[PDB]
Amino acid sequence: MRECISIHVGQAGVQIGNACWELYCLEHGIQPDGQMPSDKTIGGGDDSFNTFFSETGAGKHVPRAVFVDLEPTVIDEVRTGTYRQLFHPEQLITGKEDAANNYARGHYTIGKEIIDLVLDRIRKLADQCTGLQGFLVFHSFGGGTGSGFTSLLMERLSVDYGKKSKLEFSIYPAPQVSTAVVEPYNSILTTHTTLEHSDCAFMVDNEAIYDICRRNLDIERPTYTNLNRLISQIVSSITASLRFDGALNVDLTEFQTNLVPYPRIHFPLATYAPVISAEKAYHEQLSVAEITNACFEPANQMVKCDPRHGKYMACCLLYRGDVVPKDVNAAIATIKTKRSIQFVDWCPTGFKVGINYQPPTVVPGGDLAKVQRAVCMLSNTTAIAEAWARLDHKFDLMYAKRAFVHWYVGEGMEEGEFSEAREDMAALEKDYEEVGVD
Amino acid sequence: MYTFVVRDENSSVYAEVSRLLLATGQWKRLRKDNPRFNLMLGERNRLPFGRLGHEPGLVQLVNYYRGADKLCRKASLVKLIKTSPELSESCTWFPESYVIYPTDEREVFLAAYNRRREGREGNVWIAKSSAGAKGEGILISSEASELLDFIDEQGQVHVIQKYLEKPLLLEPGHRKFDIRSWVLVDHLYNIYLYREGVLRTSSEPYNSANFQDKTCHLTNHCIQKEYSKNYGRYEEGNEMFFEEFNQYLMDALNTTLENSILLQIKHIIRSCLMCIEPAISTKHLHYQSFQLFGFDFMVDEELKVWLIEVNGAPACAQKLYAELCQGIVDVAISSVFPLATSIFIKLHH
Amino acid sequence: REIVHIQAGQCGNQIGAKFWEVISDEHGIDPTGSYHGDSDLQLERINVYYNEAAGNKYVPRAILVDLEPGTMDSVRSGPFGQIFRPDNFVFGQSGAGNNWAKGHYTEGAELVDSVLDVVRKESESCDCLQGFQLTHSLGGGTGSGMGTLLISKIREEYPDRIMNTFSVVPSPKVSDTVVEPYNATLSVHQLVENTDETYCIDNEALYDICFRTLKLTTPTYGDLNHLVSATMSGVTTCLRFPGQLNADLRKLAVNMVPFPRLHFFMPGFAPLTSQYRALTVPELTQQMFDAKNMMAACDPRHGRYLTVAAVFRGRMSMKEVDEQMLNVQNKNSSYFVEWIPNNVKTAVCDIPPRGLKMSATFIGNSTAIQELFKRISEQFTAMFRRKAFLHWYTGEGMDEMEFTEAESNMNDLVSEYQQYQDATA
Amino acid sequence: MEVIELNKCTSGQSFEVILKPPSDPSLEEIQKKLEAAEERRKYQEAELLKHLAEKREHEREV
């Protein structure tokens, strides 16, 4: 067995980490006090769930996770919440003043003061691993901590753990749920410096999660709690292959091999169905073909864009629940004759499929309904570049007037990095254009 | 009240639409780069579709269908027809055409030309390309060598298409023509055919033995007005409207425009637009789309209709701007942004 | 993350006293400093403005400054006079005579050290000092002259801390003396360099609001301060109560100030009060964007918005505030700059103020704020071209060439505001 | 539409369906830049405290 260490950075990363680990415990039958009645290997074991949880002699199962925020109010809620017993204190690291949505403040000013401590605490978990695979880093593009410190952390993890894979779960900024106008700056800056150090990044536009919550759960004004419990379902479906017995996506390296032919273009598009409200007391359960079809409706994607006008480089279908291969092939045959699905000429036109028979787990008292079967499609499509263009344009509008730039230069940055990063995004946007148009 | 933006200055049609929306008293125009808009009268090239539908609390509409170029570029249109099972190589209303890069179909073009040459079938051909506008870039011949040589001389793509040697010829004049039809597709993908079409008329008598002359075989209004001495001999501006053409067919050939030609027109429109419906439809998309299309047909002497091209940024006939432009706002825009008989034939599908 | 409050001069100490009366009520603390409230949500972020003391008492983290004891003697005897720390009254004896030079260079220089001594003690007992807020007028001598002096001294000892001010701008319609434009111009030059956020409270606007809209034929300083304290309660409401969104002074400044020198905000409030009819979200939103609800005598339609923040208080159809906020922008979309995307942000605090079920506070960084500085610059030059009343200042050591510099910098400030009002994408 | 590499266990199955076949920085280099921004931060702070020192002179000059 090979362990995976999760790192949750900034408010968004931390709060989403709370949702994931809450869901993980329910999926594995672990109680809030860390006891696991179903585990008969007391004090140890190399089972599949042990990739994410270590075991103590007392029988407590402990997430291989580190939480880190530059201000404590968010992690303080972890230290006192339902799962306070799950984590032991040195896993939770807090500063005193945050980065004020300033990439430079998080990366340079405050980053330098706390980077060594964080790495030391990460090394204390890596020392408990017999065959560490890599890291899963949860953070926001928009926040100062989530953007600036994460990039710093990613840089030094590539030096101290050179041959270990690093996966990102990144929250793409949306005006509907943000109170910050400088997020485009932080998004471009962090992407530029993190790009070379990330093997696979799953991007989640808060705009997508917002509409999905109100359209499919009839929640009039979703909160972060609504959004995080939905995101955790997707995160779980993506990470389930690492935590349960299986053949597909069992090593972090397989995510890169299956989903990323070119290193720079490592942003797969996630699509998830079915999202069903708990208020609908009796619902017409959806067939395999209906949820598989739903994977190609932009309204169900984690990032709004049109794959019809891009090209696919890889596709994985991660079913959870009562699904058998035959029903999948039936749907795929029908779907291909009814949808615009063009692969690049230098890649096969095929789906890598995986099925876990355990149905999706929903947190008691949540907003989601329990369903018989669900699917998360991971697609590396050029259409995701639309999200970069949107962001690049917002960056351009403010930078032409140098708006807000003084806040970054005042923290030690040079204007060069703004144009240096923006130029990198220009290439990235043009790299997507080469691969998928004409 | 609603807002909109103009991003195409050289647009005849939508110049009147913006003009007429303003005069409504419920529409407000903004700069060419203010995203806080309800409607975008976008540009013909590199319209930023990716930046639409991401403004909170703003329904956003645009007057173009992303991907509609596959029907409005001559080379792509050929590959769409030949490779679409809904249309197929066995297409009765499209002339046997081939895409020739100066993927490529050079042999297979010569393939039938040889079989046709041996069979004494009038193997007269034409080459075309979407780049050459203003009647520049057009070659007609009877043997490939002289035509294919012209293709290689230029550096862009060119399609070779069977020139139709037996067009329906009007009298008096013994002259050629094409038919232009305007079709509006709204956000719901209803297909609306404008009840008024126009014939772009050739003012010179047809001559099959002589294509040396550069005006007896093309009739795009511009050519006739700049390279023909009889621009307007028979009708105002080389433009004959349906009422007159219908009366002519009744008197000369004892038939109607609706029966002899307009049924085939409505079938080709439906066939083309429904073929691409799953690739451009915006029914469940974060932004909606409509678009005005200009289909160009022609009629042979057996009263069969042939589609020649589809134009995605078409101009209108001078007389009909008012009525048509008013029709767009009614069906395409107001249908989405309500306010305080019909001129369209709904092509049902 | 604690805030240290400072109030200097007559105006500063009186709007300051009302501010503490208001928020003390909102948090449930009586004039003696004892908490007697109904909800624990009042106390979650009480530390932000209060220290906890022996006997389970909360003491405002406030410092009281003046060069003459008159107004400060009143505060101690006022409604909440006994709430303040008696050690935090640092007052001189002579006064400043509405003379900027006396507060900044002579009389104030003597007392300033005693003021910073109290600042250090308040700062040394702060878990993580967040910044300072100053209340003061720009037309007097103590608040204007000494206040800008204190700001300069605080930035020297706390250069990485946020310095914010609620600055009352003078107006002939509510004028104490004629040299008020001189003192204002000198203070603004200091505020342009040493503050991060200045809320420009214009007494002309407060008067017009009291007289024209509230139908008060003869307003007092108490009537104007009721509006100023209401705004300060609204501006600080998100910091003082457990509010869904995480509000920090430096995070707020980063999001509101695109250019360092253009940090002068127009405050706004709705409804305007001195009734029982429940005000609807349609009515709250359209009022806060009206010139008649602005605390700075400037027309927003004569300028452009760099950033905007509307803050709604109470239980309300929050889906409706969104619908309407997005409505009011479409009506005025020409008055928002296109080069700062999504520059209108909204925050909601479920707890309303006293006597209202729904309220709304408006914070705007608009280029129309130049109209205020242009007004002050005219009054300044009208006297300065004839050097009238300068002897009051040259007698205290100042040179007329410091006056010329201040004038130039404020006309430079106006020019900069004009640059971005005409800028486009 | 070929089905290949079908592995299966008690927890589930996995397979692949094909429809159409195909047609480095160091630590020292980092540490420097964090310090290069730190030294730039100090220079801005020194320039501020000098500007303030200049204004303290003028104050007591008056």
Ligand SMILES: Nc1nc2c(ncn2[C@@H]2O[C@H](COP(=O)(O)OP(=O)(O)OP(=O)(O)O)[C@@H](O)[C@H]2O)c(=O)[nH]1
């Ligand atoms: N989905 C989701 N996104 C969040 C959440 N919290 C914050 N975000 C995103 O992050 C932005 C706000 O910045 P934060 O992530 O909270 O702050 P940070 O990353 O810790 O950086 P600092 O606050 O400056 O220390 C918002 O605009 C969101 O896009 C959350 O709970 N869920």
Ligand SMILES: Nc1ncnc2c1ncn2[C@@H]1O[C@H](COP(=O)(O)OP(=O)(O)CP(=O)(O)O)[C@@H](O)[C@H]1O
């Ligand atoms: N297969 C065919 N048979 C007969 N004539 C043909 C033909 N293909 C093209 N033509 C001639 O070419 C002309 C139309 O050319 P085409 O429409 O491709 O140029 P164009 O698209 O640049 C002008 P527009 O943009 O206004 O539609 C007609 O006048 C017609 O006579």
Ligand SMILES: COc1cccc(-c2cc(N3CCc4cc(OC)c(OC)cc4C3)nc(N)n2)c1
């Ligand atoms: C004078 O010292 C103080 C003391 C306390 C607060 C302030 C202050 C308030 C403020 N308000 C209120 C709440 C709020 C919350 C937001 O999101 C969470 C938001 O969007 C980022 C904007 C606003 C607008 N804006 C600025 N700049 N300062 C100043």
Ligand SMILES: Nc1nc2c(ncn2[C@@H]2O[C@H](COP(=O)(O)OP(=O)(O)O)[C@@H](O)[C@H]2O)c(=O)[nH]1
């Ligand atoms: N709103 C308000 N403004 C005041 C008050 N007292 C003075 N001012 C303003 O400040 C100016 C007079 O300055 P003053 O308060 O005497 O300054 P001080 O000498 O430092 O106390 C006038 O032009 C007023 O605009 C007050 O009680 N309320």
Ligand SMILES: [Ca+2]
């Ligand atoms: Ca075990």
Ligand SMILES: [Ca+2]
């Ligand atoms: Ca690496």
Ligand SMILES: [Ca+2]
């Ligand atoms: Ca003395």
Ligand SMILES: [Ca+2]
């Ligand atoms: Ca001293």
Ligand SMILES: [Mg+2]
């Ligand atoms: Mg934070």
Ligand SMILES: [Mg+2]
């Ligand atoms: Mg054309």
Ligand SMILES: [Mg+2]
């Ligand atoms: Mg006074």
